[PDB]
């Protein structure tokens, strides 16, 4: 539904997925990083009912669903559910088919390599995106905040990476990764 072949941006956290197009100041829509599945035996015939629900569908029908998060502490392990979320996100609600738009994804610098590799593989092989770029949260946070220099303490849902940047340069020896995040605060 867009009138320009701008890049797409999709911030796939362990909590929620914020997505929209590049050049804007906000995601156009926010979806949970969830694929839901029924935990009950169907009783009635001709009720429709999906084998799995995606994003906002998973929360909307959650009364009888178990809701799973494909991403654990920032890393995707269930790529199949990620593909479902992305297809819904890009084609049904954001109305941007990746085939016609380059796509940028986000991740902690110490997020295990499989995350950036699998996300890149899926956008190129199941979505046919013309181009890809996996960006680092510390970089992204300083740009959003109007800084080139500072400490990015991302107290997000998954893992906190705590990464210092000076004059645009990483200072990797000073990174303190902490296994504490919003999901644990909720559990407490």
């Amino acid at each position: 539904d867009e009138d320009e072949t701008t890049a797409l941006v999709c911030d796939n956290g362990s909590g929620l997925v914020k997505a929209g197009f590049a050049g804007d100041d906000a995601p156009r829509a926010v979806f949970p990083s969830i694929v839901g599945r029924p935990r009950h035996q169907g009783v009635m015939v001709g009720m429709g009912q999906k084998d799995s629900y995606v994003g906002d569908e998973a929360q909307s029908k959650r009364g009888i669903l178990t809701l799973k998060y494909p991403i654990e502490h920032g890393i995707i392990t269930n790529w199949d559910d990620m593909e479902k979320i992305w297809h819904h996100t890009f084609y049904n609600e954001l109305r941007v088919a990746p085939e016609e738009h380059p796509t940028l994804l986000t991740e902690a610098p110490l997020n295990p390599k499989a995350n950036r590799e699998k996300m890149t593989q899926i956008m190129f092989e199941t979505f046919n995106v013309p181009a890809m770029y996996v960006a680092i949260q510390a970089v992204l946070s300083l740009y959003a905040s109007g800084r080139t220099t500072g400490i990015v303490l991302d107290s997000g849902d998954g893992v906190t990476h705590n990464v210092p940047i000076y004059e645009g340069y990483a200072l990797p020896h000073a990174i303190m990764r902490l296994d504490l995040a919003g999901r644990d605060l909720t559990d407490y």
Binding site: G23, D24, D25, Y143, A144, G146
Partner: protein, 56 residues
């Protein structure tokens, strides 16, 4: 008895005041590098609104 020591004093004062003079010459012909600058500031007086760019 009064002329010789006078001439010697003239020569000594000449050499000393003349090294003083050649260095004071450099001091006076150029007094610009010993100056300073205003160093103005913009200071962004607009704490009533924000900017257009995506980063802002």
């Amino acid at each position: 008895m009064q002329a010789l020591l006078g001439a010697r004093a003239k020569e000594s004062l000449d050499l000393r005041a003349h090294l003083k003079q050649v260095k004071k010459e450099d001091t006076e012909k150029e007094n610009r590098e010993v100056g300073d600058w205003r160093k103005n500031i913009d200071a962004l007086s607009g704490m009533e609104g924000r900017k257009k760019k995506f980063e802002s």
